[model samples]
Target: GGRLSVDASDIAEASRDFGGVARAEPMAVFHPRAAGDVAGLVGAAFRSARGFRVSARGHGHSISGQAQAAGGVVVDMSRVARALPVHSAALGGHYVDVWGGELWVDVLNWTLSHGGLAPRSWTDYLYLSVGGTLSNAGISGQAFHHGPQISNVYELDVVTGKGEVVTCSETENPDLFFGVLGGLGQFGIITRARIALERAPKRVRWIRALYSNFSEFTADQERLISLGGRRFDYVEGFVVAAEGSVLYCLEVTKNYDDETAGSVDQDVDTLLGELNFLPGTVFTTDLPYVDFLDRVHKAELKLRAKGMWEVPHPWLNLFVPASRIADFDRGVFRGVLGGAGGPVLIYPMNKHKWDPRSSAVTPDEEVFYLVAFLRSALPGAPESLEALARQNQRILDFCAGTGIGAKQYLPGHKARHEWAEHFGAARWDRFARLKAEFDPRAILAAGQGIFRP
Candidate 1:
């Protein structure tokens, strides 16, 4: 119960996240070795002052200062590491129970090394902490077939505001289990998670093609997702402006091992023949599965060397109903501004695979498109941030004015009303009830700004 520090360096360093947009100085920082240390500060916050509450900082990847706790305790969760990949064959499945502080990249490397096993779903970026992505909805290309990372979870170990350490799953402690899965860190702080795994693949056939027409690109995307996991293992697309023309880049991949490598080239060609792409625009390659998954990390190294990696990332992600995706693309994707900040991504995912009982909310439509506006800017300049912020607002404004059915993914606004609008009235009601049950005093993840307790 003796955990506290007032070191100025620690407080300042912990104040920033990957966003580099907002900064909130935590009064003190506490490096929790385990769940026990996490429980202590949360328990104290229940009866402590009214201003700030205990916030968990996991790899500090939040685009906003969602992990920051001004004048309160910032629990540094990165120090704790009890994650050891365990492959239990006799149990009919392989699973790994990892600390929330662990990175997704480490989990992938370790599981592949210990035994040829891999998690079912993964986000595009692997450096993010397990708990941070779970707090929101962890999604990527694989989400098309396997659902989001939250859907593949077996269980979680959470430390509640009442200082209770509880293990929750679908059947056991079901309320907390549903509440914590994509619960946005409202119910409690996730200490550890038991992730579901499957046999790993040896190689990946990564393919890319271009389309000049939006209708053709989206038509092919919808057609691919509806076909299930037969032709493609992973599917996604991006919008890039090149040579004074807008082009849609459709990317797809197929996973293979030694047993299936002989016929994989034929399968990929057959699928490509069915799609409508520009002539001579197809670019394809084969690489190890590990290398394909870590493609972004390679780009990150180049950005880091240029000192642009740790800058202001005014990123925007949204889930749009299939019915309105074309309209959205016409309004913002093609009309917004130039393409200097970053690449724009758009892909399809099946909403039928998602579990409605979980706290993660999505559109009611069966088919939805994930459209993300990912942008990065040089930091230490107020005007750059302001210009980027204005750019983000333009997209948001266009969505609202056009009546497009779009929902935010990892978005954060400064007002409680905005959050209420984001979750809708019904989901927010259920979310608030669960918060009252587990986080009665609202002493956890105060930076979310959804609850006032």
Candidate 2:
């Protein structure tokens, strides 16, 4: 039997999200014992006379309450998070099958202990749930080398909108498989994911360099990524918007073992020599691979000490075409964000690595940059929650006005018209068809605003 709690404690936990903006009190919180229990709850809602929605709550890290279902049911996935086992395929190599609710940190730990291996892709934050990040395309510095988290998944076990428990992959029920990945939890709730893995490195050399010119920063990032196997294992950059001018920081990492450690310094030197960053601005740190991967958590600890971890995060991520990045830098980075203080991530990803069939949308170019404004709002600061929200809108309006054709990453729009515009005409038509096919009643992920519950 499954556990369903209507207690204030459970509902309260499900109501709020990391965004610190929206709140939705659900009717109850369901703790499923297994995939069947999840199906049973969804099936009950599907067959009810007056249907209610069911939202899967994974870490509740969604910035816009994408996991909250008002007056409906919230499935706490952490309870059923049982990572099965790591397996090997003769031709396909290594992969670990894990429960969808399993956090990436747990998955990495499991994979390392089982086979000294790990997932190829990652998000900068490791505490995120496996299913949660896959739904939104988990991205990080490693993405330039191995693609997004969605790209690394080989299979998925999804509980569809019709309450059907389906096993999907590239070869089996392909449409549903592709739909569920980056599907924004609309078509189904993922219960299991078979993630591709590889040999784990023992150590990582993380380095950061400064660039005053946007052109030099992006060109170096693009050049480093294009070097194929002869380059750094991880490539990412961020723009530091000062009150007067902008500074770009190029972050790169190289993974190596004891046997390869000697070459790392020279290899890094050669790579850095190829870049045009400002002199004497390079910073280097060497640490264990896990420590380097979990570096964000260390920063989180410092913020938690200051009670800033749970603050409002009015974040906006956009995939801007490489051609128009300078224009964006000139306008939004220099124009609207006059004194905004936050980490602005800007990095390029190859279009060839991503499958066109998936629901995730990116800019229509061979190479595009992910411009993420990861801002946290203080209650009484000059950049309050509402002020930051307005700044976000102004940035979006500037993009629209200038015809920048930037596609939003982790898009959260309340209007159907905005969703359509975000997906464009053709892709939106396809997304609509997929939604109709899998979640006809649209009683799933109502918080996404893609469809009415």
Candidate 3:
């Protein structure tokens, strides 16, 4: 669609999504076609009499108020979701240029279609925009192998708060590149991203092993990630009901048809003995690597159909230091998270592979765990959401009390202390300095509530 004016009704329509909390009506919405269009809209807002602010909305997946701005210009980056090829040589070096608004699912499918690839890391749900999650940190099962998405990116095309178009990389424009990776849209609006790629196998060996005890689960996951071999291409685990829940089902991906079916079945029996699940409730399926990665979209569609997708999700994603993972699980998983209303994802990731200079935060230690509590309000469940939120707070409190180095993924809230604590003292200061240098006015992403304009 072309640049069009939207009224209050339109604002309300565009303001909400999967994360239905903290919806705000924007004064105007701008659909920018190109980077120049973005620059033009931002420049106009800069000179507007009302002192309009700009916030970039990528797929509108932000659970908190990070994606909204009241009575300001909201730049919907989803309008420019096109994937443009910069050069084949650029892609040959394990890097490909794509519009920031492009979904990671599309990027993965496109790269796999060609010979090139972009293998930094990903979220469990690959439908997220490249820039949207990169603004925070794109992490997933593969994070242990590669660092977060920001750590693997080579360059970015950004429109700074000062309204300048700049292409930056680690070596060139290093300040902006590092400043914007996990900068949370404080420094600039990323219009294009040059991501690092790898030679992907034709298929992935996807497997899920269950553990009744937290100690065993963490040990096995940490061992595999730390080993850093071709044993398992992906490594991630989750906490399911200790009793009789339908969540421990096995989903795998493989090629050569029926060749790997028996392997997965045998492994499941060997791994999950008398744990939690029902005796004969083991389900297995094999799909292509691409199909496996996009599996969450099917669940997403089902939720959307049931009107559950638009509910408020007080999701809490954290990276806990490996030294404290056991203690954390004992306290939070068994205590506070025992009856959580949503899925709990707990997996180990390697911190040594991550570049400290990147914006993504990690523990001072070498290894950490990506723990996510994806909570949502289910049908006919009134207090489920609130209960989940309280449980999330309890987990955060335990992290604080135990002195565990914890960093929130896709973090959001109105509180400065909470956000500051999410990023440590030293890193917070660096982030503030970078914000001042790149976005002195704090005109972009005001909804994040990190700084005042």
Candidate 4:
């Protein structure tokens, strides 16, 4: 069994997160040796006369207090990180079993060295835990085709708030399986996950092009994503508003090494010919697939050296429907946001790629765009933390006033009604019922502020 620590240092560490905005210290921190150890601690709490809330903390990357349990118990999941040997099935291909606390980077390294395989889906930042991202529908440019990480999971071993340790999958405990995939740690604490895998790519041809016009930029992004076979392996774009009066779109792509090196130019040219970007603005480079995926870590190193990585990040990510993207561009990008302290990414994702059965909600459209404003706040800067926070509210108010159907991704809603409106009536009811069923005591992940303990 894992030991419980009331150490002052551990409590302090569990109280903060990447967002650097919210603080909630737990009364105790539990370091589990395994999943059963997690169950033992939670079971005791569940059976106690006065139950205490428990939250699973994986690297503490939450922008809100999603992973915190104030005055309760915080399960320090990172301490239990480990992965089992790769398992191959005759009909099911390959998969690797990993602890909930295992970081995506560690999973990639382990799978590549042990099985020559990698997960089909990924988030841009790999330092996050497998369980953390899966709970929130881990996404990236690849989600347009492969869906999010939650969709890629085959099975999970979860410790319910009621203290039962259950193995769930599509054909077994199907409700818990789907519910826990994007359940936001409300239904249960994911202890172990069976990640679906495929052969890892060797290299990637990374390309970037600039677009000055909004319509053509979105049009080309939509067009690129709509292509079928022989298409780019990954597609994403960012808006640069720091320039004079005009905004520029930087469209990026990655073409993997399945096709021969000689055909790469012809293939890339054929795809580029369809777009209407400015001539001589194209930039291209080739690198190993691992380097391309772990690209954000390199930036992190530089930022850390410069004392910029640990600043408050008031990021706002929204899933805006394709029909109203132009309106969003005109109102928020062109008018409301004068300039950004960091990258503002706008990319389209097919709604059909997501599974409705899961708890993750997206805009009600055939296609929607993920518009992310990832900004950092520094003292005595133009983009102060409070200033950026107000900017985020203004953008949300704009969406509300204009009636643009935008759903917040990794949403942080302070009000219950807002969360209800975010999920809509039917899904919200279903989510509540599942929560009552699995976490009847409401003593799990209380930091989410959904149900009072």
TM-score-better candidate, 3 vs 4: 4
| TM-score, one value per model | 0.95, 0.97, 0.87, 0.96
Q: Tell me, by lDDT, which candidate is best.
A: 2
Point out where model 1 deviates above 4 Å. 1-3, 49-52, 80-91, 338-340
lDDT of 3: 0.73
Q: How many collisions per candidate?
A: 0, 0, 2, 0
Cα lDDT tens digits for candidate 1, 148-239: 99988888999987778899998799989888888888888898899889889999999999999999999999999888456698889999
Q: Which digits, one per residue and each the tens of the lDDT, describe model 3 over residues 1-453? A: 238458776687557656666777787888778888887776666666655678888888887768787787788777334443344564465667888888888889888777745464677898788889888888877777777788778789999887789999877999889888888888888988988777655445465545455665566676667653223556777677757521323222222234554565555444445234434544555566677778799998998898777677778888788888878867886677655246777777777777777777676778877778887877656587777677778888888888887877777656888768767788889888898888777788888888886
Stretches off by above 4 angstroms in model 3 are: 1-4, 7-9, 80-92, 116-120, 245-284, 380-382
What lDDT does each candidate get? 0.85, 0.88, 0.73, 0.87
Scanning candidate 3 in windows of ten residues, the lowest lDDT window is 245-254
Question: 71, model 2: CA deviation in Å?
Answer: 0.2
- Candidate 2 runs further than 4 Å off: 80-89, 241-244, 380-383
lDDT of 2 by residue, 1-453 (tens): 789999988999999998877898899999987889999999998999878989999999989989999899999998434454556666367887888888888888888887689988999999999889989999998887788999999899999998999999999999999988888999999998999988899999999998889888888999987775568999999887554478989999989997898899899988888889999999999999999989999999998898788788889999999888889988988889865345888899887888898989988998888988998988446458888899899999998999998998889888889998888999899888988998888889898878975
**After superposition on all CA atoms, what RMSD does each candidate show versus the true structure?**
2.0, 1.7, 4.0, 1.9
Error of 2 at 378 (Å): 0.7
* Models ranked on TM-score: 2, 4, 1, 3
Report the lDDT of model 1 for residue 76.
79
